Design a protein around this ligand. Structure first.
Ligand SMILES: *[C@@H]1O[C@H](CO)[C@@H](O[C@@H]2O[C@H](CO)[C@@H](O)[C@H](O)[C@H]2NC(C)=O)[C@H](O)[C@H]1NC(C)=O
Ligand SMILES: *[C@@H]1O[C@H](CO)[C@@H](O[C@@H]2O[C@H](CO)[C@@H](O)[C@H](O)[C@H]2NC(C)=O)[C@H](O)[C@H]1NC(C)=O
Ligand code: ADP
Ligand code: ADP
Ligand code: CL
Ligand code: CL
Ligand code: CL
Lengths: 207, 676, 207, 676
């Protein structure tokens, strides 16, 4: 039999079966730990070992990658890099994708602190109390990390969904707000400036 | 308002000066000067764009950082007083320098240059002081938060650059710079002003052939191939210069993704495709835009007439513009404060997300409609996914900004009208798309990114009734050539439906100053007038061998101040008064290589000064080598549509009328011909 | 006791997410285990259809799917439609994805017979000769199905099978007909290229 | 050859007609221009339909027999079949050209330029000349001549324009009472402009390229609303073509096919250029100018060989047959001897030949032939890098430059553009392949970009038109910033090509003795005034004459003029020959009006066909009512750039020269502005 015309090679079977023994794990990791967005703090070692199993066979690569008009191993790594660049879990990872990053691991705890205060303060009158001094520093920390990535240049998906839940739960379903009835001192100015041009026109029209 | 002479003298000193260059140098000088006009206009455009967006980013960063500190505390009204001041500061600086120093830099530069290419020389139109003041004023007014555009004054900037640097002369510095020394007649000046206006149009809107056809609309001359190809040359130079320099400002250089100051994008993406059945929809939008243009121009006309009659002190119309900026600040803050919707960042659509009352993740919608350049709003009234605005907010912005732009035109500031017309027209023209999506369900062909463009073209053709150059600009700036057909139907419709009511915004402010302004054709509802009506039958003619006692009689009479004389009675040619004083200063008598005619060429020395003596009142002056030996001598019985298409097409400012006898009877100048 | 979808998901649809994930991770196993021997459309044409049926069970519609900016499930199913509509696996399917088509399994059975004819005749003396009939009938059926296609590419299985057959027939064999056909075409070529100078000279001399 | 008036006679009957209509005619011109656009679009679509269908039917024979013999042997029968099909279609499509009417040969452009310039080539507008040329291109592109069909659309546009403007078919000898105002040749010259512009916009899909084509020739005064009606007809023509091709291809509401050839769109960002390769683009223009000079010189000496020796019609038919036979055998030598195969990926061949290849690959030289040349030109602009064998393009280019050159002067209705663009994209692609060999495949060494610049290089080299070719290549590509390298390339190629030989179209103008006019003076001739130019004897009339003098002047039998002045020697007017003919018929020695002067407006009856020599030719004659009272008039000391400016920009055909007193000497009549 000629090489790679009918079938595989013995030193290319394991070079294919390791990737299938791991990419199923990573795809399952995404969809199992998907919608409560815990993704960047769960699936990054599985993702990095998928990258490494791509590399150790990418270095019969021309017998697998460039051997078929629908390059299955290329388009599958391409989709994972598409997700990993769209999620940007590299923000949530410390130095060499080994551990979680320095600030965000504390941001996730202040998310959990704010949820514990929400739960222990359970007609949402007193829930507007007792947590506004923690919701404010939580939003301050989020905006501080967002300005941090602004100085480097959408953030990491793990923290953006946490702040999205926090804002979607504080602002509505609690309706906690401050009126700040500063309407009439605005109207005390916004009418006086609009009253200037009729004075300016009818002043010079008579003189 | 005195015309200039695009016609050539062709006397004996012209025939001598034709030698020694044909015994080929000047053509490459023409090409290099046109290239420098293009480069300098591109550099001025980059100056304006970078300085304006940096100053405006500074201003709105200061204001945006202010309001969020004062939100929950209760000092919102004290932040209104800052932004009402920050508008009023720059407009005050931006109008004082315009009113007292050079009042000709008011409004746009486009009516003055449009009157220039017809031959009329408005006095202070092409000085360098006018350039400096108009550029500084458009920076201070676009940064000054008014409802203005900065593509208006790019025509006058390019025209002033072109009339300046094609001289090798400044005269506002009293210097000489004898480098070109041949491009100092009004023919060359008019040709280079045509090149500079075309480069200004191309630097403004990013379409070069719009620039060439614009500078060929006005100055409806005979066709001249190498001229128009040089005009196109300078246009391409200016576009590529602007594109290259704004490219390397963003540190990329490798795409060249900005040909003009306003840039529309790519209209090909198959959600923008149009069908043949919605052509009457486009006609209907042309009707709608062609009557709001009439409303705009009419309400400006009764507003401008008031300002001319009363507010004409140069220190009093300055106070007006400050209050205009204050009203823009107050009205915009009132509209922002009272918008009940919030809408999140879609990925960088707003660029200054001003949360007022929202739910801590979302931002205000109306603060995106204000707090921006109008140009980003116009591009974003295009190109959005459908279902991306609130029609109360977006229609409410339209209902205010139309009157704010109608009210901010005749001030003593350097402003535009294009992008305010495009911001109005892309607004209600967007709203028609939401209504078509409301009355047809989720129809694909009612994509409001398509109808927002037809409304922009409709409004822009309604307000400034200009079709051929505008159609090519709108067909090329979108970079899709199948859109020219609905756009040209829209523009025809809007011009007809507009001219059945009112004149037109550029022509109306021309007519309010009573400049002559020869139109494109004759008023075709005038019958076969021969030349025996439209001429001036008492003629002040001269002679060839004539005693100088009727020269100083006719140069100085203080009640019949003319310019240009035919010499005889038969006819021998035409002599110019601007050429005939140089015959008196240098004492040409029987008892000079066309360079004393051209050294002190602009602002010819007025004959009061010379003081000829009484014995030189019987001496004889022979001007046979100075007259134009070939004037343009229409007969008496020539009809009026014949004598227009010589006087208008060829760049004339005299026209002799003679007979079968070749007796000189009458003469046709511009004032004696644009009075019908 | 927080309101649903805000802290976590309800367990009422978490089961749907979990057995979607268990099923959808197996499809990766089909794609990568059955990759280089390209048995793709005939292996997980059951596994792809059950993923489509589980998309219908989750269609908690707005609770799962349209409540995040990185919709994991939706972009995963969009990837499965993309991999589906480039392989064109419907051409292997019969009418409504119930089973294979008789034409394609007929082709594959003839294909394995062609490979056995390749294997029995194993210095390519009796390899090129006495085996050409199988290559011709197999390419005949290929061009037959390919002409059948256009009133309605193909399945990746049969197309990569024919790629194997053409790469084997072309190289490592060079089973090439010599086709000694040069001399008549050279005779006709010189016969016609010499006509114009005859025409030009007979035009010049008749003068 | 015959001249063509453009200024109206302005006689008192036309003034009476002005007064009668001025108690609504411009509205007719819009719908006539719209019909010209619609009909030119439908002709272009009909040509595209039948040329796709016949050539689609032709190659399915040839592929189906090359593939039949390639497993047994005997391709000489296939080669004789392919040569027989090519010679048969070219025989059928050329026997109607040499024998029936020899004026439809080649593209219309050398006749349309001279017609817009005012030379009536004796068969330009004829229904027979149309249907020869419409059915000639169909039977010639399918014949396998190396030509392109986008060329001869300009003549189709002009013929249809001048045909449907008149409401009368002289080829059918029937009439209509519809458009009596428009048989007057002031109008008829301007409708040919609209038809040629619409033919250009339906050809290449660039509707300003039509406008700035038909404004280049016919270099007259800026007739504004004419220009706007021309752009109207241009846009309607390209929309009609796009609409009918998109309802024929399916997907009615995807108007994807603007012109006949569609270069794509260049928003791929591998096509992006920057400044560090701008002087590379000057080097491509030099090679384009050199190869265009080689092209035009080879074709020039070929035509000098063809006029003297091959002028019998059957010799020309045998010549046209024995090129298509040679072309197929050259192509089959190249395909049969090619040693490279590349497999198909998507639609790139559509008739692939697995000639000797490995059963899934296909012959690459078979892909370069066996196609529409449009598909190869578009593929060379947009195939990804690393998709061609350089030996393959070298062989194809090197044979195709001669087959384009050898097949131009034949008697077949065909173009030269797509041959010129195909050569230019062919050698231009090699210059982009070798730069990916020196730079190590950088990003600015993008070979799809250097095929675009070589296309404009070769096309500017072969025919020397700019601003009608810069505007197309901006607008077909739909990337605006590409005009700047294209402007540089066209300037370079025109300058380097003018130092060897003239343009191809001006060549074929001057090789058949046309009194043609250029844009300007010959070089300078400023000293050469109107003294040396005018004709010395004057054949002039009088208003108080006697007929019989009319008979002798019109029956000189040695001169055959057409313009005659009338004096008292004081110049009163200028009477034509044809008006004087019509005055000789009816009894003049009252009812006569303008419709009597439009009786069979082309080809009036000559002087021998009127017997008025017994009672008439003995009495007086009054033409005081019938005269042009104000003809344009220069003095003899007018310099030639003032005489040529007044003559060319007005469409005059008789410029009377009158001295100091009104006495007539000489009358400049277009031959003496071409001899210099
Ligand atoms: C047939 O197999 C060959 C390989 O033997 C395929 O060639 C590959 O094609 C892909 C894209 O089609 C390229 O990315 C690879 O680099 C190529 N590799 C080699 C080694 O040539 C070919 O595409 C296959 N054709 C079909 C129709 O499946
Ligand atoms: C915050 O949560 C909301 C929903 O609670 C997200 O809104 C959805 O966004 C996606 C894409 O961004 C859309 O396809 C959905 O249609 C949206 N939902 C609805 C109900 O319209 C929002 O994107 C989240 N923001 C972030 C930053 O995660
Ligand atoms: N030689 C002349 N004879 C009669 N009228 C003249 C003569 N020159 C000028 N005029 C008239 O004087 C008026 C203004 O002319 P002028 O001051 O030269 O202005 P312009 O800038 O239009 O040339 C016009 O009404 C014009 O017809
Ligand atoms: N009546 C005339 N007197 C003098 N020269 C004339 C006269 N008629 C024609 N010519 C000259 O004859 C030449 C050709 O003129 P002709 O053929 O009659 O004009 P057209 O170009 O309209 O056919 C020109 O040089 C023209 O000046
Ligand atoms: Cl503006
Ligand atoms: Cl403006
Ligand atoms: Cl062509």
């Amino acid at each position: 039999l000629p090489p790679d015309l009918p079938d595989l090679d013995p030193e290319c079977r394991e070079l294919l079966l390791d990737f299938a023994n791991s990419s199923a794990e990573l795809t399952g990791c995404l969809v199992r730990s998907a919608r409560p967005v815990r993704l960047c703090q769960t699936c990054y070692p599985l993702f990095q070992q998928v990258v490494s199993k791509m590399d150790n066979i990418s270095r019969c690569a021309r017998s697998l990658l460039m051997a078929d008009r629908m390059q299955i191993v290329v388009i599958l790594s391409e989709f994972f890099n598409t997700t990993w660049q769209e999620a940007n879990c590299a923000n949530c990872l410390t130095n060499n994708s080994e551990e979680l990053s320095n600030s965000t691991v504390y941001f996730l705890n202040l998310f959990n602190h704010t949820l514990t205060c929400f739960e222990h303060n359970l007609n949402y009158s007193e829930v507007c109390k007792n947590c506004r001094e923690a919701y404010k520093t939580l939003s301050s920390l989020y905006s501080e990390m967002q300005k941090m990535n602004e100085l480097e240049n959408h953030l990491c998906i793990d923290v953006e969904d946490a702040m999205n839940i926090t804002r979607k739960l504080w602002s509505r379903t609690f309706n906690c707000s401050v009126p700040c009835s500063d309407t009439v001192p605005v109207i005390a100015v916004s009418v006086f400036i609009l009253f200037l041009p009729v004075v300016f026109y009818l002043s010079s029209f008579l003189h | 308002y005195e015309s200039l002479d695009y016609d050539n003298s062709e006397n004996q000193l012209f025939l001598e000066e034709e030698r020694r260059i044909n015994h080929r140098t000047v053509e490459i000088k023409r090409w290099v000067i046109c290239a420098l006009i293009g480069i300098l206009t591109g550099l001025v455009a980059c100056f304006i764009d970078i300085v304006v967006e940096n100053l405006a980013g500074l201003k709105y960063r200061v204001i945006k950082g202010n309001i969020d500190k004062f939100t929950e505390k209760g000092g919102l009204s004290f932040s209104l007083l800052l932004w009402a001041t920050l508008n009023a500061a720059f407009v005050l600086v931006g109008s004082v320098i315009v009113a007292f120093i050079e009042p000709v830099a008011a409004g746009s530069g486009i009516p003055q240059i449009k009157c220039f290419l017809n031959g009329v020389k408005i006095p202070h139109v092409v000085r360098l002081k006018t350039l400096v003041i108009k550029v500084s004023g458009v920076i201070l007014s676009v940064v000054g938060g008014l409802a203005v555009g900065k593509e208006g004054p790019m025509i006058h900037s390019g025209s002033v650059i072109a009339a300046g640097i094609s001289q090798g002369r400044s005269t506002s510095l009293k210097r000489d710079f004898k480098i070109f020394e041949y491009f100092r007649r009004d023919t060359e000046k008019r040709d280079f002003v045509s090149a500079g206006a075309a480069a200004g149009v191309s630097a403004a809107f990013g379409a070069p052939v719009g620039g060439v056809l614009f500078s060929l609309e006005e100055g409806a001359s005979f066709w001249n191939q190498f001229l128009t190809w040089r005009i196109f040359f300078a246009s391409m130079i200016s576009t590529f210069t602007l594109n290259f320099v704004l490219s390397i400002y963003h540190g990329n250089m490798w795409d060249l993704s900005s040909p003009g100051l306003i840039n529309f994008g790519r209209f090909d993406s198959e959600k923008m495709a149009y069908t043949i059945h919605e052509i009457p929809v486009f006609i209907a939008m042309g009707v709608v835009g062609g009557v709001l243009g009439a409303v705009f121009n009419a309400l400006n006309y009764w507003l401008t007439m008031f300002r001319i009659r009363y507010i004409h002190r140069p220190c009093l119309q300055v106070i007006e513009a400050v209050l205009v900026a204050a009203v823009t600040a107050t009205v915009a803050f009132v509209l922002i404060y009272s918008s009940r919707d919030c809408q999140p960042l879609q990925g960088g659509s707003m660029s200054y997300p001003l949360q007022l009352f929202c739910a801590d993740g979302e931002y205000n919608s109306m603060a995106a409609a204000f707090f921006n350049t109008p140009e980003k709003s116009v591009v974003s009234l295009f190109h959005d996914p459908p279902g991306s605005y609130n029609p109360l907010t977006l229609g409410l912005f339209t209902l205010v900004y139309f009157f704010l732009a109608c009210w901010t035109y005749g001030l003593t500031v350097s402003a535009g009208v294009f992008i305010p017309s495009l911001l109005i027209g892309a607004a209600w023209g967007r709203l028609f798309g939401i209504s078509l999506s409301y009355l047809t369900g989720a129809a694909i062909w009612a994509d409001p990114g398509k109808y927002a463009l037809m409304g922009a073209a409709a409004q822009l053709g309604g307000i400034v009734r200009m079709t051929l150059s505008l159609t090519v600009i709108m067909m090329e700036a979108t970079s899709n050539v199948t859109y020219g057909f609905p756009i040209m139907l829209v523009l025809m419709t809007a011009k007809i439906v507009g001219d059945v009511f009112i004149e037109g915004l550029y022509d109306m402010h021309i007519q309010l100053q009573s400049v002559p302004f020869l139109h494109w054709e004759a008023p075709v509802t005038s019958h076969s007038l021969t030349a025996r009506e439209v001429m001036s039958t008492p003629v002040t003619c001269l002679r060839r061998r004539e005693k100088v006692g009727v020269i100083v009689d006719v140069l100085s009479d203080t009640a019949s101040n003319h310019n240009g004389f035919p010499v005889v009675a038969r006819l021998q040619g035409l002599i110019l008064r601007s050429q005939l004083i140089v015959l008196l200063k240098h004492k040409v008598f029987v008892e000079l290589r066309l360079k004393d005619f051209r050294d002190a060429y602009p602002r010819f020395p007025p004959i009061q000064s010379i003081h000829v003596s009484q014995d030189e009142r019987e001496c004889t002056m022979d001007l046979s080598e100075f007259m134009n030996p070939s004037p343009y001598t229409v007969p008496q019985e020539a009809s009026l549509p014949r004598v227009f298409k010589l006087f208008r097409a060829l760049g004339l400012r005299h026209l002799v009328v003679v007979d079968n006898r070749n007796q000189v009877v009458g003469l046709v100048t511009r004032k004696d011909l644009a009075r019908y």
